[PDB]
Specification:
Chain lengths: 135, 118, 824, 134, 118
């Protein structure tokens, strides 16, 4: 009793300096059934982390009906093959065009300068096909 | 299946008592060349029944089980139709399930009688 | 608060049926309602969804986001969780929700949510300020004015623009109630429709040729060899018909069903043809799904549809790719149409700009007999690109000539059909006049005492909208000025003050709405209406499938069903006449003794064609009486396709899949009638714009935005995405004007000036543009002309103008995606 | 040329309107041929619809043609003429009686897309007819 | 007798190697509902042959022995037609008298396979 927040795990993804510009890294968060991508965009964006404030991370499950989306490096979007929804990786998962009614969920990363570590520590948005982000 | 070859108006007609039980119900056997048939108009078939429209209840007893094609000793093929006689006092046109099968239980090379001793 | 979880519906939750509020498709949904302090368990048998939330769900298992949930507060003060989700077993959508349908829960009325500015009581502009007033004061003023106008001017002084449509803000109850009031009681001819400025049809030519515009099933799109989408962006505008029916055909999922129906007919891989000047998301997605080899984008010059169809008709006739036995048995006028419509492929190509090879290919795919001998099953789907096109009547004449000659009506897998806009739900008395009347022009010229906007907003959606707003705001001002000299006047004195103001150019304006809208800039009176779920409502989709949307919650405040608003008005008028000793005038307002919306259904839809009924025009037909609310409930979200053929308790409602399958058309002689289709170029008024100014100002739908954004304007996600109406522009045009994404431009011509944010789009052709229509920030229609066809149908897609940079909106650059909306 | 009868395709109803063990009446392949469709409530070989349980029959007795009546308690068709009874759960199998043919089955297409049941053929010969299609 | 039901253009077609001798000739099995049939026009039947006029020698191997009506476990009746594959390298469309009877020697309740152990 009491608690209003979900008990998110703290999961190491990588050190920031290992990420190459526009080369997505795959990981699971907050458990192995929830596929995510982190990408260094190469140019600062609102809420980007790391040395150049440019690293973002998302749940890749489409928020319409749950197909794994694919990161397109040329547009920096996530595209869903199910009903052609496309999300903007540079505008916090904003839906460019599609059938979803939620933005692509953001994986919240802590960036520690001391260690260079990126740690997944939360999700902003609801992951498809889940009652709560933490099962 | 879903149709029957009608006996022509001039088809051969013989008398046949049921093969089976004591009642001895009266039937007619219609016999005719395989490549002929009756018309649907009542005067163009041997039954005298109007097959241009649905028949009412009790008008006929007629199923595919009451029909066959026999192959005679001369190699020629003939439609047969074995049906109850309406004017027989015994049965007044009734056929039991047993007598109703007589046509099917006549000897043919490919039918129910195929294993007849020859 | 709480972005990262959802309250599941308990296993025993209440569940009602709801048809989607918005587009023609009419997708089926379920509404789960339950006390706020209860929830479902994650185990599949402990929640109402029957889904297993103890581990991740697979793709396609569910459509469920927080936008599909809400907490309502009812008239008793008690709070209930709601969940509005698509029905997996509805045939229309098979569990699909669009982004528009998907937001229904969010767009239900709650005190703190997106619906928080719902109209909850009568609003009065008391000369110089907005105030609340009572229903009885509102009726005394509104009925009082109408009565005064009837007594002095007759019905010609009383004006309406009203919905004629289905779904939310329409439907059979509502169209009957309004129509009975306007036409049987008041008996005014001064009535326009929500989307067009006279009392007319979108489909005069096809109807007159004997082919009502909704003549097939959605299953027909599954059975077709070829689909034509003419002036139509169906991925965005009729999403789930495109997704659930068209795409499965293009993917080969329906091939085995075609073969089972027609055992001795070849079924090649299905193909699709788009007639659209613009390369749309629908074109792109069709290419992605089917390959470039199974899509033909006939990227015509704007307004050249008639040339296109005359050239194809000429060609199929010359090749003999027509049904001569069908023509001979079931048609009239063919030989004449061959003469009047003759156009060579070379002439066709010069006018349209489409190469001759593409014209021939489209004919080959669509009309040349298959190997097995049968003509291709070609469904011809059209919408607003031709309905609001270059001479609505003539284009339909041309198109239908092609369809009829090729027997693409009445065969399964065919149809020449509207895609539709709203749902349908029309039952009304006949229009009481003998003339088409261009209502906006009448208003602009200073006619009328009182104008009511009912469930529409022509400030945002009229053609030549700037002329309209100008005139209405000024006429509204005259009434405002006259009202404010009053102090302590009775209602009846106020009626006289206002009426006098209207003799000096004024106009009393009433809006019957969900929300204030931009009409609040002019209105003197606003009445609160109720939408589906706050009321019961019946309507049908693009294949005539009638469904009951069930009430599950209260309206805000004293908001009422529009049919019951109409009854309230009628009863007020009756009472005034009775009091004034005018028995004959009172009698005209009888027949609105209605306590619930069902009463309107019984009085209208269920009376059509019955003994002792008056003249009623109903899409239910004369068997509408077989439909009841209880029977529709038993039918589910699948309803029945109209017309109903039979009913009994054991069978349910049995209806009609496709029209015209025996070759009997809706004309005097039972034959389909060919018509001449002259090519006369663009209208002189439009051509003048094109001659003076640089850009074709195409306009229409965005997938995410519904209509005039009446809900969407209050949705923080929607406003972050589209804070302003956007204009798709060619990148090279953009460079020439020194604009990029998130700059603001003025768009202007002789008809008006409006504003948009720049959206660079590589697929837009040089000298062409595309602006979102009807929006709350930058109204597109200001630059549309006053030109209409013979039946007063506007060429909304026919205007030209210039573009001027205002400047860079840095905030749009920071927050709005200008990435491509054409998927590849 | 043709070896088959030209059966019409006749809409009966949508499957989901049928209640378990409540017979629906219709005519097929013409108005003089009475038929019944029933949802049995339990899958049977060759049943159609979502639960593979909808079946349909000619109700004219294949003995001498009286309209039979569907008994809901036994799921049979009983003939008042000479007491033939057919099993609706065994494709018209004669349980006891004087007929020499099972009760003809109306062949239904079930379309998932529309939920339509369409009568498209008959298996067996209907009483008092030279062919099922007159 | 004197006619055959053609396979519809969209008839199901599976591969079958002859049941019998070493040669292993290739055949096609066409299966379709009993109450459907192909048209005589070559594009309206599964064989692709023109039955609107007499066929020339070698155009087909097709007799009634190469046809049957099976009754499946669901009670539904289906036409079958078991004919040699013209493009099989082993036989180039030839059928022996033995393989040619495969249709007849499929199990049906009333045919040559009627006494099959069940
Ligand atoms: N997302 C969403 N969907 C909706 C709506 C909504 O507001 N939002 N509104 C609904 C309503 S009321 C309606 S009416 C429908 C309308 O649906 P549609 O008519 O499908 O949509 P529009 O964008 O108005 O126009 C379709 C196409 O017409 C083309 N066009 C323009 N000029 C011409 C021309 O001369 N000829 C041809 N052949 N094409 C031309 C445009 O490029 C455009 O892609 O959508 C309904 N569905
Ligand atoms: N330039 C240009 N102009 C166009 C078009 C175009 O393609 N180009 N499209 C045309 C088309 S096809 C259309 S459909 C029209 C649309 O023109 P409108 O009909 O003017 O706009 P909508 O947004 O459908 O209007 C619905 C209104 O009713 C309200 N409403 C919603 N539910 C209810 C209800 O239950 N009761 C009542 N009383 N009010 C309710 C909403 O708040 C809103 O104000 O615009 C037309 N205008
Ligand atoms: S079995 Fe007996 S009842 Fe009659 S038909 Fe044969 S004699
Ligand atoms: S969800 Fe609604 S918006 Fe149309 S596509 Fe379906 S009726
Ligand atoms: S028996 Fe032998 S010759 Fe051929 S058709 Fe059969 S494999
Ligand atoms: S499942 Fe992703 S767009 Fe539908
Ligand atoms: S007529 Fe039916 S049992 Fe004899
Ligand atoms: Mo519209
Ligand atoms: Na004041
Ligand atoms: O519309």
């Amino acid at each position: 009793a009491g608690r209003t927040t979900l008990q998110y795990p703290a999961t190491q993804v990588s050190v920031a300096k290992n990420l190459k510009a526009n080369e997505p890294v795959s990981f699971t968060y907050p458990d192995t059934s929830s596929p995510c991508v982190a990408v260094k965009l190469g140019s600062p964006v609102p809420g980007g982390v790391g040395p150049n404030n440019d690293i973002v991370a998302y749940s890749v499950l489409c928020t319409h009906m749950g197909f794994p989306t694919s990161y397109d490096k040329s547009s920096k979007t996530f595209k869903c093959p199910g009903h052609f929804t496309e999300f903007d990786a540079e505008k916090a998962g904003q839906m460019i065009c599609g059938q979803a009614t939620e933005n692509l969920p953001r994986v919240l990363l802590r960036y520690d300068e001391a260690s260079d570590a990126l740690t997944a520590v939360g999700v902003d948005g609801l992951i498809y096909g889940r009652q709560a982000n933490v099962i | 299946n879903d149709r029957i070859t009608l006996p022509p108006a001039n088809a051969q007609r013989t008398n046949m008592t049921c093969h089976f039980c004591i009642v001895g119900c009266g039937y007619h056997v219609y016999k005719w060349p395989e490549l002929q048939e009756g018309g649907r108009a009542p005067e163009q078939n041997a039954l005298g029944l109007d097959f241009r429209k649905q028949l009412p209840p009790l008008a006929v007893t007629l199923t595919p089980a009451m029909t066959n094609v026999v192959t005679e000793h001369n190699g020629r093929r003939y439609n047969i139709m074995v049906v109850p006689d309406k004017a027989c006092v015994v049965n007044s046109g009734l056929s039991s399930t047993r007598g109703g099968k007589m046509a099917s239980y006549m000897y043919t090379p490919t039918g129910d009688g195929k294993q007849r001793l020859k | 608060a709480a972005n990262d979880r959802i309250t599941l519906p308990p296993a025993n939750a209440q569940r009602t049926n709801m048809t989607c509020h918005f587009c023609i498709v009419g997708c089926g949904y379920h509404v789960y309602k339950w006390p706020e302090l209860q929830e479902g368990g994650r185990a599949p048998e402990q929640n109402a969804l029957g889904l297993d939330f103890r581990k991740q769900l697979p793709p396609l298992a569910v459509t469920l986001t927080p936008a599909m949930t809400n907490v309502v507060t009812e008239h008793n003060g008690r709070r209930y969780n709601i969940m509005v989700v698509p029905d997996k077993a509805c045939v229309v959508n098979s569990g699909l929700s669009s982004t528009r349908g998907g937001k229904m829960a969010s767009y239900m009325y709650t005190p703190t949510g997106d619906g928080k500015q719902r109209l909850k009581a009568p609003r009065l502009y008391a000369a110089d300020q907005w105030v609340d007033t009572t229903w009885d004061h509102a009726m005394a003023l509104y009925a009082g004015l109408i009565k005064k106008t009837l007594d002095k001017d007759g019905p010609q002084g009383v004006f309406f623009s009203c919905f004629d449509h289905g779904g939310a803000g329409g439907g059979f109850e509502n169209t009957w109630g309004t129509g009975k009031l306007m036409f049987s009681a008041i008996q005014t001819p001064m009535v326009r429709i929500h989307n067009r400025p006279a009392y007319n049809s979108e489909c005069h030519a096809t109807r007159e040729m004997g082919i009502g515009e909704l003549n097939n099933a959605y299953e027909d799109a599954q059975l077709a060899d070829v689909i034509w989408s003419i002036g139509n962006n169906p991925y965005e505008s009729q999403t789930n018909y495109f997704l659930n029916h068209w795409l499965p055909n293009l993917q080969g999922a329906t091939t085995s069903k075609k073969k089972e129906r027609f055992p001795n007919e070849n079924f090649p891989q299905a193909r699709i043809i788009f007639v659209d000047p613009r390369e749309t998301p629908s074109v792109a997605i069709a290419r992605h799904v089917a390959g470039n080899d199974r899509v033909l984008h006939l990227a015509i010059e704007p307004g050249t549809d008639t040339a296109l169809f005359n050239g194809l008709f000429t060609y199929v006739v010359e090749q003999g790719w027509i049904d001569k036995p069908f023509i001979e048995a079931h048609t009239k006028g063919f030989d004449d149409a061959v003469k009047t419509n003759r156009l060579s492929l070379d002439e066709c190509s010069n006018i349209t700009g489409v190469p001759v090879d593409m014209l021939k290919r489209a004919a080959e795919w669509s009309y040349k007999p298959k190997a097995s001998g049968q003509a291709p099953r070609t469904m011809h789907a059209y919408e607003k690109g031709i309905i609001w096109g270059n001479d609505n009547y003539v284009i339909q004449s041309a198109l239908l000539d092609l369809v009829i000659a090729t027997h693409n009506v009445g065969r399964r897998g065919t149809g020449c059909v509207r895609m539709g806009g709203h749902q349908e739900g029309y039952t009304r008395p006949p229009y009481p006049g003998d003339k088409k009347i261009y209502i906006d022009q009448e208003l602009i010229k200073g006619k009328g005492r009182i104008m009511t906007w009912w469930g529409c907003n022509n400030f945002q959606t009229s053609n030549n909208a700037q002329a309209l707003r100008e005139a209405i705001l000024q006429r509204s001002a005259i009434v405002k000025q006259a009202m404010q000299k009053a102090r302590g006047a009775t209602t009846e004195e106020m009626v006289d003050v206002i009426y006098e103001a209207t003799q000096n150019g004024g106009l009393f304006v009433t809006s019957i709405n969900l929300y204030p809208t931009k009409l609040a800039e002019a209105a003197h009176l606003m009445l609160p209406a109720a939408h589906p779920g706050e009321m019961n409502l019946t309507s049908m989709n693009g294949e005539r499938r009638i469904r009951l949307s069930e009430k599950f919650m209260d309206p805000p405040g004293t908001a009422m069903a529009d049919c019951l608003i109409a009854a309230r008005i009628a009863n007020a008028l009756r009472d005034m006449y009775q009091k004034d000793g005018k028995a004959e005038m009172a009698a005209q307002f009888e027949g609105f003794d209605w306590k619930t919306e069902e009463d309107a259904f019984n009085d209208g839809f269920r009376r059509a064609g019955q003994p002792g009924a008056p003249a009623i025009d109903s899409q239910g037909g004369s068997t509408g009486h077989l439909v009841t609310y209880d029977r529709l409930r038993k039918s589910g979200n699948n309803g029945v396709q109209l017309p109903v053929v039979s009913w009994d308790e054991s069978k349910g409602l049995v209806g009609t899949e496709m029209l015209y399958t025996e070759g009997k058309f809706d004309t005097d002689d039972g034959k389909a009638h060919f018509k001449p289709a002259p090519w006369n170029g663009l209208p002189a008024t439009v051509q003048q714009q094109k001659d003076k100014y640089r850009f074709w100002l195409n306009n229409g739908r965005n997938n995410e935005v519904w209509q005039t954004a009446y809900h969407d304007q209050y949705n923080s996600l929607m406003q972050e995405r589209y804070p302003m109406a956007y204009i798709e522009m060619n990148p090279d045009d953009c460079k020439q004007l020194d604009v990029t994404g998130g700059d603001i431009v003025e768009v202007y011509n002789d008809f008006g000036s409006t504003f948009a944010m720049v959206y660079p789009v590589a697929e837009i052709k040089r000298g062409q543009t595309f602006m979102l229509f009807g929006y709350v920030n930058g109204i597109q229609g200001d630059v549309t002309t006053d030109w209409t066809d013979r039946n007063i149908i506007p060429y909304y897609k026919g205007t030209w103008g210039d573009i001027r940079k205002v400047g860079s909106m840095e905030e749009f650059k920071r927050t709005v995606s200008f990435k491509s909306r054409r998927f590849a």
